[PDB]
Amino acid sequence: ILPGAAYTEKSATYVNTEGRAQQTKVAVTPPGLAREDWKIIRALSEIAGMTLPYDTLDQVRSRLEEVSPNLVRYDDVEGANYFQQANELSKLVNQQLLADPLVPPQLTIKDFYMTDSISRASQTMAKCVKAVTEGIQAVEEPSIC
Amino acid sequence: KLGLREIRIHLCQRSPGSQGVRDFIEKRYVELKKANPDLPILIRECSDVQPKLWARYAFGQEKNVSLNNFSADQVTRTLENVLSGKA
Amino acid sequence: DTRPTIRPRNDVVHKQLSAFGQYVAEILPKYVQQVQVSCFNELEIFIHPDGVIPVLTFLRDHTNAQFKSLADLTAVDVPTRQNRFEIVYNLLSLRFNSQIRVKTYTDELTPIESSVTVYKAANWYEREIWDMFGVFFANHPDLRRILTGYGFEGHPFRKDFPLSGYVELRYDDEVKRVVAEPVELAQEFRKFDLNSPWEAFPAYRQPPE
Amino acid sequence: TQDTQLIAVDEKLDITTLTGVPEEHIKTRKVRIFVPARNNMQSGVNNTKKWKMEFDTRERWENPLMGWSSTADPLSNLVLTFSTKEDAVAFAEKNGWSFDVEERKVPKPKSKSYGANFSWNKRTRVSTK
Amino acid sequence: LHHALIPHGKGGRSSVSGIVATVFGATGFLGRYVVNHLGRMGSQVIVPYRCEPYDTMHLRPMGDLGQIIFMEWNGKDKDSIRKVVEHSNVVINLVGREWETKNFDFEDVFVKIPHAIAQVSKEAGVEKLIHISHLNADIKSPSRYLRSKAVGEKEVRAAFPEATIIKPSDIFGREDRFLNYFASMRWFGGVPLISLGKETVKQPVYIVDVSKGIINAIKDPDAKGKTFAFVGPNRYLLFDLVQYIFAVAYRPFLPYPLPHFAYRWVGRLFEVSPFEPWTTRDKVERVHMSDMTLPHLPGLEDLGIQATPLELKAIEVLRRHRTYRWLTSEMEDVKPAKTVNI
Amino acid sequence: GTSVKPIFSRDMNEAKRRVRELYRAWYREVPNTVHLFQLDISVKQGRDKVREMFMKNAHVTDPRVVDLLVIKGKMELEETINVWKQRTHIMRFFHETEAPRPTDFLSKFYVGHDP
Amino acid sequence: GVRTSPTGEKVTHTGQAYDDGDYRRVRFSDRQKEVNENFAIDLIAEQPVSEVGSRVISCDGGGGALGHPRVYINLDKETKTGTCGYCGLQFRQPHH
């Protein structure tokens, strides 16, 4: 088991569904002995022998820029195009569509809460899940105090 | 093995310095992928980038080749020489 | 009266100080940049640095000015402005009892000429600025560090300097002496987020752009 | 007009060694400038009208005594204000801190009319006040 | 590791290193120094004591508030040991005297006390134990000091299989009773070396070196079970060593030839004082006993520390004994003694 | 903009001159401050510390900055010469109680979260 | 109420109790873990439920100016007892 850092402890980057690459800054240090997720990989590589060239955050961002130049440009949608050639590119297999009705995995507010590891770890998520499941009179928390 | 594992293309959005490659993938890409369906021709298009080409072969080695103002036939050749060298 | 809480307004002193401000502006147009008198009857003169010696001398010597007392000398670091540091000279008159203030600007490196001769009280005050803001003073008789500890670094009143400093000192038996160590607080300074997001004084609103 | 033996000095200021900041604090530390977003719990606006710079957060461990929040980096609760981002970035480079830039996000002005609360055919008609 | 034991900080006073020491008998010489390295890095030491806490106030500065908790302990009490080591991860044994107390015999402070320490420690569940014992310890050495230390080592190792036994050679450093010993030997007339002391080689170590080695052995993962030997970089024959320290102190040197039995008589005479005898018979049977070489014992540099030569750091220790005629003199005036190397 | 006011030195050559006799004074000082302050420092390992501190600010190229370092070293020289400084402050340059700090990335990862 | 830990320590009103290993218990050997017996959790529960007969009830906490700021609690909900947030006395309608 290699403990890692959560999304509020690292200083890494994520991408929205529209392609814009945003950055998450470090809020609180990772608990215990867990380090960041790229630092541990690089240290693992250095110990194993096949050392990676990058050593701090700016170098790994530069390397990721080398891999993809859109993933460093922050908070601006990198204009995506070339759809028609992609359409003409697949258009070969048939893979006849099954008659199974389309049902998203989330169908009611009860399953909107319990999706990821963070949600499962949470207790308030379970409290609201059980609020939704049975009925109204299950989760009354005194608000005056 | 040493045969190339993925080929990455970084072309600018509108700037004329990357115009030629934009025409290349415009017409000379679909059959190129049909020729090597297994091969990941990645096109990580972006803005204000000089038209550049990465080539990752095996073991984590990568090859750098610029395509600054490269014509469509010229970029076709600079892809063909790399693809032919399946090693 | 109708305004028992609001402070009294003394417009006579205001007009008279404004007249003297026009006076001093006309007398030395070479170094003076902008003179204005505050609402509470306190006049300030914004001069170019090269006028540190001349203007002060004119304020120290002139018969109709007659200011010989250096109340205090201070710098006010503000990182925003191009020349971050601004130096304030506070003068008090005896024959014409009143308080005048002259203000100059300098960055970290551009030296500002040392008064000392105009006001021999400035000397120690002068040293403080150099030892507290980094503003070196040209041909100051002895610009050695004055306040901070021996072998210190930086200039603490700079707004970038942290509140807790950089290095503490404590006994070490391994070397049998007081030693300097990098900062490691036992409890970190909690920085409260005051200054409510609602506008306080409409009069002093910054113009838009 | 201001003769003081002036000299062209092209390279930017390097007051770093003058500031006395230790080597790892001037090198490792990364500072970002930004306009602080208003607290959504409030509708007040005059807190996103300045350019503040702040530094990357560091280790925050709990002391054995009461579980306090002892830390090691002195430049943690240090935030500097600036009128325009140009002054802030100039300060950052001349001091020597690796800086990050975020553009001043401002609210887009939306067309608002009370006559939209009611309508003859538009969906925007409200159902309660 | 326990949730209150994860290392935290940056090695300062308030850094939580993750060490809970015990430093038994830390109220003296190296006990003062090791706590320093334990206090400076940040670790809740549980330093026990038998004397008056006055002779322990000098441990208060060398630690942030909430550290170096003091607990009363008695030698002939297993319960006191249990109380001191109930909540610890490392137990450090430094309890050892040099003169035979009329109440505490030599062996108890060197086998019975260490044996009880090891037994109660192992019962408690402490991870690592570091017992200290003279390098020259031999079962049949003429001095009962080394003999008792050898039986104590074997007893502790039997009781605590993974104890990290440390065998330091003669140690110097401020209050040393070795450098200051020969330095004050002028007080008792001319220096009475046994047979003028041309036949005794010594391998001294700087106290900071041994203390740092103890700290690394705490941090070292493989230190369990092993037995380290602490030796200096260079080794001096006794006569030139005394020459060097006297020259550093600039006090005139008057070597005095002496038979072994005559020095035994003098040691018996000195053993009758009622407080801290300047020398003992056992001390005489120690000084002429040269320190052997134990290459098969893992040394000091393998731990990570670098041995500091005696010439560099003799100034501070011998500085006080210098009179004002040469109290202003530096190191370089004294040329390093003719070390007899390998 | 580019034009600026000097402190003393006009060009890199004259500031280069000022640091020269600053090092002169430090050289002639080190032995008798070792003697006077009863330093545990040795003469050679006194001089090399001066050399390493002078080499520490090797990157500086702006003149005014060089005048600033030279005048600050001048203040340091006065503080040392007439015994206003104290032995502890002199030792402050030598980092004794400060534990060695690792440099490689692997040790940094082992110790804790820090770049 | 104050209860003993499995180790033997007296738990606090907040629920603090050092665990089995919990090396930070040497602080209490040769000393004591100072805990207050007058638990505020239960010293307010046994107080009688006031039966004042009005819709909305004022509460200053007793002592007038010496009490807490005057709050108007609502004795409306039939299924529970209204209580002042500051002090904690439970107010209820006299069974309507």
Ligand SMILES: NC(=O)C1=CN([C@@H]2O[C@H](COP(=O)(O)OP(=O)(O)OC[C@H]3O[C@@H](n4cnc5c(N)ncnc54)[C@H](OP(=O)(O)O)[C@@H]3O)[C@@H](O)[C@H]2O)C=CC1
């Ligand atoms: N050059 C050297 O000094 C060398 C020393 N050693 C070993 O190092 C150990 C410690 O040496 P050092 O620190 O110089 O010795 P000191 O006598 O200077 O200090 C002994 C320490 O243990 C305590 N102590 C000693 N005897 C007793 C006792 N009978 N009962 C309770 N506590 C006791 C002392 O406290 P208190 O004063 O209250 O008794 C003090 O904390 C000994 O085992 C010694 O043989 C090994 C090689 C070389």
Ligand SMILES: [Zn+2]
């Ligand atoms: Zn109440």
